[PDB]
Design a protein around this ligand. Structure first.
Ligand SMILES: N=C(N)NCCN1CCN(C(=O)N2CCC[C@H](C(=O)Nc3ccc(Cl)c(F)c3)C2)CC1
Ligand SMILES: *[C@@H]1O[C@H](CO)[C@@H](O)[C@H](O)[C@H]1NC(C)=O
Ligand SMILES: *[C@@H]1O[C@H](CO)[C@@H](O)[C@H](O)[C@H]1NC(C)=O
Ligand SMILES: *[C@@H]1O[C@H](CO)[C@@H](O)[C@H](O)[C@H]1NC(C)=O
Ligand SMILES: *[C@@H]1O[C@H](CO)[C@@H](O)[C@H](O)[C@H]1NC(C)=O
Ligand SMILES: *[C@@H]1O[C@H](CO)[C@@H](O)[C@H](O)[C@H]1NC(C)=O
Ligand SMILES: *[C@@H]1O[C@H](CO)[C@@H](O)[C@H](O)[C@H]1NC(C)=O
Ligand SMILES: *[C@@H]1O[C@H](CO)[C@@H](O)[C@H](O)[C@H]1NC(C)=O
Ligand SMILES: *[C@@H]1O[C@H](CO)[C@@H](O)[C@H](O)[C@H]1NC(C)=O
Ligand SMILES: *[C@@H]1O[C@H](CO)[C@@H](O)[C@H](O)[C@H]1NC(C)=O
Length: 339
């Protein structure tokens, strides 16, 4: 037996206790060693309801990544509502490692193993676990990077597809490598290379899956309509530096267009922090090639409103609520208490 319950979990990771990498250093002193002998205990013919849009686990992962970043990625200056703070900001080594979220005795995590589970609703293949899987705290917008992939057809996750204000998460079943670089020796100019032939292939598929949820209909893509730079550009952190990338060449409906699409990017110093509060200035990029090859495994979409009288739905990349970023890997988990 069990009851829908919330508690205070602990974390686990394979952090190498010697590395200077910020994540390892933080997980070394804030997480326990990964369970060496873990086991799924299959709850046969048990059907439990899940919900990833109202999950405390997300919030508990948020507090960690807010803490980890604030312990390691310190800005030279914090313009937090006037309270401008000058402090130290040495360049560091930044590469996320997997983190596990375990329950204390008296509770357990129920993991939905349905291959087509969309995050909400009921699950029929429930199994019980003590620690989640190695989740990578990847901070990014528009595109979800370095995550897990749907084990079947493309899944469309949303707290309510009808409400257009609720964000749409797309869990791809095939990753698309995005390769970003800042050439050695303007030091903020950079670019991301994406195979245009796989992107549109996968982009086509997303449309197909999106038509199913909107009474077939016409599904068009358009760049974001206003907002802060962090959301109009595909923002992400690579080797510690903040890359801003113009995804105008990906969210056009052009598709003689299937070569290597090169995205213009800029390493930005003034960042509109994702943890909340305000702005923060960082030091200029390190010398050398700042290269990060990453898997696109999801997309942050936001549908336009008012097309109820029209015959087409417009979709624009979203982001900025990193809670929906962890939400894309914690969807299959849920904390219940052993009553
Ligand atoms: N109840 C709560 N707990 N709310 C938490 C949400 N909190 C409040 C609102 N809130 C924002 O509304 N925004 C929107 C403006 C853009 C900002 C951004 O996302 N910056 C960014 C920087 C670097 C990278 Cl790599 C990146 F991907 C993104 C953040 C903050 C958190
Ligand atoms: C349920 O999930 C398990 C993994 O926990 C896997 O064998 C398969 O997807 C499902 N199996 C059964 C018997 O439902
Ligand atoms: C997810 O699946 C459940 C199954 O009951 C359904 O109620 C819900 O509307 C689905 N949500 C989306 C976004 O498809
Ligand atoms: C990227 O995706 C490939 C297959 O899609 C996978 O084998 C590889 O482990 C992924 N890399 C990362 C860093 O997740
Ligand atoms: C991914 O899902 C789509 C349906 O959305 C399907 O057509 C395609 O074959 C799937 N690809 C893989 C590799 O599973
Ligand atoms: C989904 O959003 C629509 C539009 O706001 C609303 O009418 C509907 O009640 C919502 N569904 C639920 C289950 O709240
Ligand atoms: C990534 O791009 C750089 C610059 O174009 C190139 O030198 C490198 O070989 C690329 N790597 C991959 C895996 O595509
Ligand atoms: C792009 O992807 C397609 C299909 O996956 C592949 O056939 C092609 O070789 C890729 N192009 C490059 C430059 O790697
Ligand atoms: C991205 O590039 C396109 C075409 O060059 C441009 O119209 C758009 O303004 C750019 N995005 C931003 C956020 O400036
Ligand atoms: C994704 O993973 C690869 C290899 O694991 C790494 O090189 C890259 O920096 C990661 N991307 C991000 C945004 O952390």
């Amino acid at each position: 037996v069990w009851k829908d319950a919330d508690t205070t979990l602990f974390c686990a990771s394979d952090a190498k206790a010697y590395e200077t990498e910020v994540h390892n250093v933080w997980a070394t002193h804030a997480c326990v060693p990964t369970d060496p002998n873990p086991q799924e205990i299959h709850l046969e013919n048990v059907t439990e309801n899940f919900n990833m849009w109202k999950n405390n686990m997300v919030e508990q992962m948020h507090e960690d990544i807010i803490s980890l970043w604030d312990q390691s990625l310190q800005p030279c200056v914090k313009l937090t509502g006037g309270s401008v703070i000058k402090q130290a900001c040495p360049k560091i080594s930044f590469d996320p490692i997997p983190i596990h979220y375990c329950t204390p005795a008296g509770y357990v995590i129920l993991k939905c193993n349905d291959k087509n589970f969309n995050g909400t609703g009921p699950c029929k293949n429930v199994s019980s676990v003590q620690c989640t899987h190695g989740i990578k705290p990847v901070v990014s917008t528009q595109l979800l990077l370095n995550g897990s992939l749907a084990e079947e057809e493309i899944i469309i996750r949303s707290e309510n597809l009808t409400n257009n204000a609720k964000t749409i998460i797309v869990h791809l079943n095939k990753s698309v490598e995005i390769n970003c670089t800042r050439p050695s020796n303007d030091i903020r100019k950079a670019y991301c290379e994406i195979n245009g032939t796989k992107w549109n292939k996968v982009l086509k598929q997303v449309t197909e899956k999106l038509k199913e949820h909107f009474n077939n209909k016409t599904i068009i893509f358009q760049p974001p309509s206003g907002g802060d730079l962090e959301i109009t550009m595909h923002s992400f952190n690579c080797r510690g530096e903040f890359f801003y990338c113009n995804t105008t060449q990906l969210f056009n409906n052009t598709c003689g267009c299937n070569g290597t699409i090169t995205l213009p990017c800029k390493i930005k110093q003034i960042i509109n922090m994702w943890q909340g509060t305000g702005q923060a200035m960082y030091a200029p990029p390190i010398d050398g090639k700042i290269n990060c090859v990453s898997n696109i495994t999801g997309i942050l979409l936001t549908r336009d409103g008012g097309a109820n009288n029209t015959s087409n739905e417009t979709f624009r990349p979203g982001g900025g609520d990193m809670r929906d970023n962890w939400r894309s890997e914690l969807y299959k988990y849920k904390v219940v208490q052993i009553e």
